[PDB]
Amino acid sequence: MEWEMGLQEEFLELIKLRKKKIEGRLYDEKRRQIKPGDVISFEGGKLKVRVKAIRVYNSFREMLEKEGLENVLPGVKSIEEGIQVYRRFYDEEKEKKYGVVAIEIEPLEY
């Protein structure tokens, strides 16, 4: 039971910053399989993270508003800007389909 992924180094560090914040991401198929009790290797083993718990919300707004914008998207200009990031990446239909699930990740690498 191991998950593997890849993302820009800059994005990796973000995860390290999410160790005290949170990480959003519309629930998907792969995510559905992702449960709080494993590890996710990024870029092979550049950034290792282990699911802590899964959550579900109404939308990014409620997530950034409830969970926290900066507690989800570090660097975001604003809540509105954040949603845009999720909109460009995540489709609105899919999102409206399920919603949003703040997957709490914690890199145990450092």
Coordinates of all heavy atoms in Angstrom, one line a residue, residues 10 14 17 21 69-78 81-82 85:
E10 N 9.1 23.3 -6.1 CA 8.5 24.4 -5.4 C 7.2 24.0 -4.8 O 6.8 24.4 -3.7 CB 8.2 25.6 -6.4 CG 8.6 26.9 -5.7 CD 7.7 28.0 -6.2 OE1 6.5 28.1 -5.9 OE2 8.3 28.8 -7.0
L14 N 5.8 23.2 -0.5 CA 4.5 23.6 -0.1 C 3.9 22.6 0.9 O 3.4 22.9 1.9 CB 3.6 23.9 -1.3 CG 4.0 25.1 -2.1 CD1 2.8 25.7 -2.8 CD2 4.8 26.1 -1.3
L17 N 5.1 22.8 4.1 CA 4.5 23.9 4.8 C 3.0 23.6 5.2 O 2.5 24.2 6.1 CB 4.6 25.2 4.0 CG 5.9 25.9 4.0 CD1 6.4 26.1 2.5 CD2 5.9 27.2 4.8
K21 N -0.6 23.2 8.2 CA -1.7 23.8 7.6 C -2.7 22.8 7.1 O -3.3 22.0 7.9 CB -1.3 24.8 6.5 CG -0.7 26.1 7.1 CD 0.4 26.6 6.2 CE 0.6 28.1 6.4 NZ 1.9 28.6 5.9
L69 N -7.5 29.7 4.0 CA -6.9 29.9 2.7 C -5.4 29.7 2.7 O -4.9 28.8 2.0 CB -7.2 31.3 2.2 CG -6.4 31.8 1.0 CD1 -6.7 31.0 -0.3 CD2 -6.7 33.3 0.7
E70 N -4.7 30.4 3.6 CA -3.3 30.3 3.7 C -2.9 28.9 4.4 O -1.8 28.5 4.4 CB -2.7 31.4 4.5 CG -2.0 32.5 3.6 CD -1.5 33.7 4.4 OE1 -2.3 34.3 5.1 OE2 -0.3 33.9 4.3
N71 N -4.0 28.3 4.9 CA -3.8 27.0 5.6 C -4.1 25.9 4.6 O -4.1 24.7 4.9 CB -4.8 26.8 6.7 CG -4.5 27.7 7.9 OD1 -4.4 27.3 9.0 ND2 -4.2 29.0 7.5
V72 N -4.2 26.3 3.3 CA -4.5 25.3 2.2 C -3.6 25.7 1.0 O -2.9 24.8 0.5 CB -6.0 25.3 1.9 CG1 -6.2 24.4 0.7 CG2 -6.8 24.9 3.1
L73 N -3.7 26.9 0.6 CA -2.9 27.4 -0.5 C -1.9 28.5 0.0 O -2.3 29.7 0.0 CB -3.8 27.8 -1.7 CG -3.2 27.7 -3.1 CD1 -3.8 26.4 -3.7 CD2 -3.5 28.9 -3.9
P74 N -0.7 28.1 0.3 CA 0.3 29.0 0.7 C 0.9 29.9 -0.4 O 1.5 29.3 -1.4 CB 1.4 28.1 1.4 CG 1.2 26.7 0.8 CD -0.2 26.7 0.2
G75 N 0.6 31.1 -0.3 CA 1.1 32.1 -1.4 C -0.1 32.8 -2.1 O 0.0 33.9 -2.6
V76 N -1.3 32.1 -2.0 CA -2.5 32.6 -2.6 C -2.6 34.1 -2.3 O -2.1 34.6 -1.3 CB -3.7 31.8 -2.1 CG1 -3.8 31.9 -0.6 CG2 -5.0 32.4 -2.7
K77 N -3.2 34.8 -3.3 CA -3.3 36.2 -3.2 C -4.6 36.5 -2.4 O -4.6 37.5 -1.6 CB -3.3 36.9 -4.5 CG -2.0 36.6 -5.3 CD -1.6 37.7 -6.3 CE -1.0 37.2 -7.5 NZ -1.3 38.0 -8.7
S78 N -5.6 35.7 -2.5 CA -6.8 35.9 -1.8 C -7.7 34.6 -2.0 O -7.4 33.8 -2.8 CB -7.6 37.1 -2.3 OG -7.1 38.3 -1.8
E81 N -8.8 34.3 -5.4 CA -7.7 33.8 -6.2 C -7.4 32.3 -6.1 O -7.1 31.6 -7.0 CB -6.4 34.6 -5.9 CG -6.2 35.8 -6.9 CD -4.9 35.7 -7.7 OE1 -4.5 34.5 -7.9 OE2 -4.3 36.7 -8.0
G82 N -7.5 31.9 -4.8 CA -7.3 30.5 -4.5 C -8.3 29.6 -5.3 O -7.9 28.6 -5.9
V85 N -7.4 29.1 -8.7 CA -6.3 28.1 -8.9 C -6.9 26.7 -8.9 O -6.5 25.9 -9.7 CB -5.3 28.2 -7.7 CG1 -4.4 27.0 -7.6 CG2 -4.5 29.5 -7.9

